[PDB]
Amino acid sequence: MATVQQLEGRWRLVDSKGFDEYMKELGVGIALRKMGAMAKPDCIITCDGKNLTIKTESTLKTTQFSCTLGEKFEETTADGRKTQTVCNFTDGALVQHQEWDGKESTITRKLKDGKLVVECVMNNVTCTRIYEKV
Ligand SMILES: O=C(O)c1ccccc1NC(=O)N1CCc2ccccc21
Ligand SMILES: [Cl-]
């Protein structure tokens, strides 16, 4: 018995795995990759019913989106991509699908050992983003 509300709270990055390779796959330039690779974002996740809000905060940039689960919406990512996106909660994991310019990326968010595991995949390049509850 798992629900999207299990992901709510305030989270802080504690481990990164393959993030540079994921940014390279997005085409992010060297300057922003150096900036991105030193950030330790803080994330606040809230979900009232099906209305979900994720606000990501760091010393470099603050980003946030609000959406209804299962309903598509437009999101401008931290690296500047204007994407068509939908979020679905399925099998104890929040699934975010991003499309832009004929390219796809999937971002999954799930709890593992109490840590929020964020997996970003694009063109078979997998990035793992580990957050601790604060
Ligand atoms: O970083 C992440 O784990 C992340 C995971 C999934 C989706 C977006 C992410 N990143 C993000 O939303 N932001 C906002 C500001 C900032 C600065 C530096 C690196 C990242 C970010
Ligand atoms: Cl996140």
Residue numbers in the entry: 1 to 134
What does the article say, verbatim?
Based on epidemiological studies and animal knockout models, the isoforms FABP4 and FABP5 were identified as potential diabetes and atherosclerosis targets. The aim of this study was to develop a dual FABP4/5 inhibitor and, to this end, high-throughput and fragment screens were conducted with X-ray crystallography as a follow-up method on those ligands that showed appreciable affinity and favorable physicochemical properties. Structure-based drug design (SBDD) based on initial hits from high-throughput and fragment screens yielded 216 ligand-bound structures of human FABP3, FABP4 and FABP5 isoforms, many of which were at resolutions of better than 1.2 Å.
However, a surprisingly large number of the ligands deviated from expectations.
